[PDB]
Design an enzyme around this catalytic site. Structure first.
Site, PDB file in Angstrom:
ATOM      1  N   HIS A  46       0.805  -1.224   0.000  1.00 21.46           N
ATOM      2  CA  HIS A  46       0.000   0.000   0.000  1.00 21.46           C
ATOM      3  C   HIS A  46       0.833   1.266   0.000  1.00 21.46           C
ATOM      4  O   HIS A  46       1.963   1.296   0.497  1.00 21.46           O
ATOM      5  CB  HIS A  46      -0.888   0.053   1.236  1.00 21.46           C
ATOM      6  CG  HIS A  46      -1.617  -1.223   1.505  1.00 21.46           C
ATOM      7  ND1 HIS A  46      -1.534  -1.886   2.708  1.00 21.46           N
ATOM      8  CD2 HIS A  46      -2.448  -1.957   0.727  1.00 21.46           C
ATOM      9  CE1 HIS A  46      -2.285  -2.971   2.664  1.00 21.46           C
ATOM     10  NE2 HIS A  46      -2.837  -3.046   1.469  1.00 21.46           N
ATOM     11  N   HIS A  48       0.986   4.626   1.776  1.00 22.37           N
ATOM     12  CA  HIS A  48       0.478   5.222   3.001  1.00 22.37           C
ATOM     13  C   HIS A  48       0.618   6.739   2.944  1.00 22.37           C
ATOM     14  O   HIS A  48       1.374   7.275   2.142  1.00 22.37           O
ATOM     15  CB  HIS A  48       1.200   4.662   4.231  1.00 22.37           C
ATOM     16  CG  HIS A  48       0.776   3.271   4.596  1.00 22.37           C
ATOM     17  ND1 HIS A  48       0.159   2.975   5.789  1.00 22.37           N
ATOM     18  CD2 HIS A  48       0.864   2.098   3.916  1.00 22.37           C
ATOM     19  CE1 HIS A  48      -0.107   1.680   5.839  1.00 22.37           C
ATOM     20  NE2 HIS A  48       0.321   1.126   4.720  1.00 22.37           N
ATOM     21  N   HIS A  63      -3.557   4.239   5.161  1.00 22.17           N
ATOM     22  CA  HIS A  63      -3.536   4.183   3.714  1.00 22.17           C
ATOM     23  C   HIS A  63      -3.931   5.545   3.179  1.00 22.17           C
ATOM     24  O   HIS A  63      -4.833   6.182   3.720  1.00 22.17           O
ATOM     25  CB  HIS A  63      -4.495   3.109   3.201  1.00 22.17           C
ATOM     26  CG  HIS A  63      -4.094   1.718   3.582  1.00 22.17           C
ATOM     27  ND1 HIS A  63      -4.904   0.623   3.376  1.00 22.17           N
ATOM     28  CD2 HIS A  63      -2.961   1.241   4.151  1.00 22.17           C
ATOM     29  CE1 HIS A  63      -4.296  -0.466   3.812  1.00 22.17           C
ATOM     30  NE2 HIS A  63      -3.112  -0.118   4.282  1.00 22.17           N
ATOM     31  N   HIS A  71     -11.588   0.579   2.632  1.00 19.72           N
ATOM     32  CA  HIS A  71     -10.527  -0.223   2.036  1.00 19.72           C
ATOM     33  C   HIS A  71     -11.077  -1.198   1.009  1.00 19.72           C
ATOM     34  O   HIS A  71     -12.108  -1.832   1.239  1.00 19.72           O
ATOM     35  CB  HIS A  71      -9.775  -0.984   3.128  1.00 19.72           C
ATOM     36  CG  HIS A  71      -8.667  -1.847   2.604  1.00 19.72           C
ATOM     37  ND1 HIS A  71      -7.435  -1.342   2.257  1.00 19.72           N
ATOM     38  CD2 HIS A  71      -8.609  -3.177   2.356  1.00 19.72           C
ATOM     39  CE1 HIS A  71      -6.665  -2.318   1.809  1.00 19.72           C
ATOM     40  NE2 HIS A  71      -7.352  -3.445   1.865  1.00 19.72           N
ATOM     41  N   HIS A  80      -9.276   2.854  -1.145  1.00 19.06           N
ATOM     42  CA  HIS A  80      -8.358   3.929  -0.821  1.00 19.06           C
ATOM     43  C   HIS A  80      -7.462   4.182  -2.024  1.00 19.06           C
ATOM     44  O   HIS A  80      -7.138   3.257  -2.772  1.00 19.06           O
ATOM     45  CB  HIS A  80      -7.488   3.508   0.366  1.00 19.06           C
ATOM     46  CG  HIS A  80      -8.259   3.279   1.631  1.00 19.06           C
ATOM     47  ND1 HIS A  80      -7.884   2.352   2.579  1.00 19.06           N
ATOM     48  CD2 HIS A  80      -9.371   3.879   2.116  1.00 19.06           C
ATOM     49  CE1 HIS A  80      -8.734   2.385   3.588  1.00 19.06           C
ATOM     50  NE2 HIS A  80      -9.645   3.308   3.332  1.00 19.06           N
ATOM     51  N   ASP A  83      -4.597   1.771  -2.142  1.00 15.45           N
ATOM     52  CA  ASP A  83      -4.868   0.333  -2.156  1.00 15.45           C
ATOM     53  C   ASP A  83      -4.362  -0.365  -3.413  1.00 15.45           C
ATOM     54  O   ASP A  83      -5.094  -0.514  -4.390  1.00 15.45           O
ATOM     55  CB  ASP A  83      -6.368   0.054  -1.958  1.00 15.45           C
ATOM     56  CG  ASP A  83      -6.828   0.365  -0.551  1.00 15.45           C
ATOM     57  OD1 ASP A  83      -5.945   0.522   0.329  1.00 15.45           O
ATOM     58  OD2 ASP A  83      -8.059   0.459  -0.311  1.00 15.45           O
ATOM     59  N   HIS A 120       3.407  -5.371   3.767  1.00 16.11           N
ATOM     60  CA  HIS A 120       2.821  -5.890   4.999  1.00 16.11           C
ATOM     61  C   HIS A 120       3.099  -7.348   5.280  1.00 16.11           C
ATOM     62  O   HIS A 120       3.375  -8.127   4.372  1.00 16.11           O
ATOM     63  CB  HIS A 120       1.311  -5.685   4.984  1.00 16.11           C
ATOM     64  CG  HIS A 120       0.911  -4.275   5.240  1.00 16.11           C
ATOM     65  ND1 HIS A 120       0.661  -3.801   6.508  1.00 16.11           N
ATOM     66  CD2 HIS A 120       0.771  -3.220   4.406  1.00 16.11           C
ATOM     67  CE1 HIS A 120       0.351  -2.519   6.441  1.00 16.11           C
ATOM     68  NE2 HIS A 120       0.416  -2.142   5.179  1.00 16.11           N
ATOM     69  N   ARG A 143       3.907  -3.936   9.514  1.00 16.32           N
ATOM     70  CA  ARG A 143       4.588  -3.255   8.427  1.00 16.32           C
ATOM     71  C   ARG A 143       6.033  -3.705   8.406  1.00 16.32           C
ATOM     72  O   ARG A 143       6.844  -3.251   9.207  1.00 16.32           O
ATOM     73  CB  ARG A 143       4.480  -1.752   8.614  1.00 16.32           C
ATOM     74  CG  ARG A 143       3.040  -1.340   8.870  1.00 16.32           C
ATOM     75  CD  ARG A 143       2.829   0.158   8.976  1.00 16.32           C
ATOM     76  NE  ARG A 143       1.398   0.437   9.147  1.00 16.32           N
ATOM     77  CZ  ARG A 143       0.855   1.648   9.088  1.00 16.32           C
ATOM     78  NH1 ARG A 143       1.618   2.713   8.858  1.00 16.32           N
ATOM     79  NH2 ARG A 143      -0.453   1.792   9.251  1.00 16.32           N
TER      80      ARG A 143
HETATM   81 CU   LIG Z   1      -0.558  -0.659   4.173  1.00 12.72          CU
HETATM   82 ZN   LIG Z   2      -6.635   0.679   2.151  1.00 16.03          ZN
END
Ligand SMILES: [Cu+2]
Ligand SMILES: [Zn+2]
Ligand SMILES: [Cu+2]
Ligand SMILES: [Zn+2]
Lengths: 154, 154
Positions: A46, A48, A63, A71, A80, A83, A120, A143
């Site tokens: 993702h 962020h 995100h 999400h 997002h 995403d 992740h 993370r």
């Molecule tokens: Cu993420």
């Molecule tokens: Zn997301």
């Protein structure tokens, strides 16, 4: 009129990588991901909100979500901006894939320059896992590595 | 219209630090520096052109120089936009200081978001050292630590 950016991903784990990004004008952004040290299988990936790593990858915030949506998957209408879905790590722990996306531009109001990419611990359930966190993080867990999106020569 | 950014400086040795940046509208940028692990004395401190750390700090390229001038001191007319001068490390190896500069905005064509801050091995001669490298790098030697300028919550 190509613009280019790069993120060097590191963390408090054995996961490392480099992600290059490019965009022509206001077209889609092309993302070349190469990350090593991953457990084979699916990993959430993702963009962020913040390029802040002062206290580790948690400093990058949530995100990127300028539209205040929930999400989802990269192919969904409801998602997002950050995403990007899952990447697949092979049996050597290497995820190498090129993705293309239209919500992470390198210019304009929603530019992701100076924000952060994060890989992740777990599979991103894409908002469909029926888990407490599905609709916010995809239940992707910790993370493992992150890096700030920085400018790089064209 | 407040904007904020941060760079987390890291490198090959134990030199590391945190630098915060803030700018209201299009005014000067206030820069709070804290870097540790430094040899006591003067160290060049510059904003380099690229937020690219793929090849350690060398991939951040040269000093940010949108006006294509030669290297100077921050108070000089003839200087690079990224020329922030020297910072001073105390006997404990800590350099803590606040600088204000007008050539390193966080918005606009010359924005430094996504570029990189670098702290150097040697003193920056400010272009006056009568050295081969004085007018490009200030003869400030190696790049001890660097970090990409990323967005951080206002
Ligand atoms: Cu993420
Ligand atoms: Zn997301
Ligand atoms: Cu420098
Ligand atoms: Zn310079």
């Amino acid at each position: 009129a190509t613009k280019k950016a790069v993120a060097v991903l590191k963390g408090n784990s054995n996961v490392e990588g480099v992600v290059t990004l490019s965009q022509d004008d206001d077209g889609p952004t092309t993302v070349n991901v190469r990350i090593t040290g991953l457990a084979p299988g699916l990993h959430g990936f993702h963009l962020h909100e913040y390029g802040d790593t002062t206290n580790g990858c948690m400093s990058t915030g949530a995100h990127f979500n300028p539209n205040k949506l929930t999400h989802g998957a990269p192919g969904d209408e409801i998602r997002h901006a950050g995403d990007l879905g899952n990447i697949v790590a092979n049996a050597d722990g290497v995820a190498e894939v090129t993705l293309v996306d239209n919500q992470i531009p390198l210019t304009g109001p929603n530019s992701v320059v100076g924000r952060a990419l994060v890989v992740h611990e777990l599979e991103d359930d894409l908002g469909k896992g029926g888990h407490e966190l599905s609709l916010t993080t995809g239940n992707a867990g910790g993370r493992l590595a992150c890096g700030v999106v920085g400018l790089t020569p064209i």
